[PDB]
Amino acid sequence: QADLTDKLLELNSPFLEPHLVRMAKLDQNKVRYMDLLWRYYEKNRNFSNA
């Protein structure tokens, strides 16, 4: 909500990936959580999922 996408991408928490996935699966803003999780992949060297 606060639109601080970068710090979120910096959060090293084990709940991050699945929460992003669930949001992009159930929300109506599929674009938002989808792009967010793609970036989250690109940061952690997770290339293929990105």
């Binding site: 970068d6 970036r39 690109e42 290339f47 990105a50």
Partner: protein, 49 residues
Amino acid sequence: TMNILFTQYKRLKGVQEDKDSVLRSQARALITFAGDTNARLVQMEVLMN
């Protein structure tokens, strides 16, 4: 031309994700312009992620 492209792309990557996206878009455009073009474009996209 492709080298100058990728250099400006790194300048923008070093706002980050958007920069890398625009870089890969430029790669794909220059690729479709000319397969070695496209091979280089995709390979750079994979080299920057």
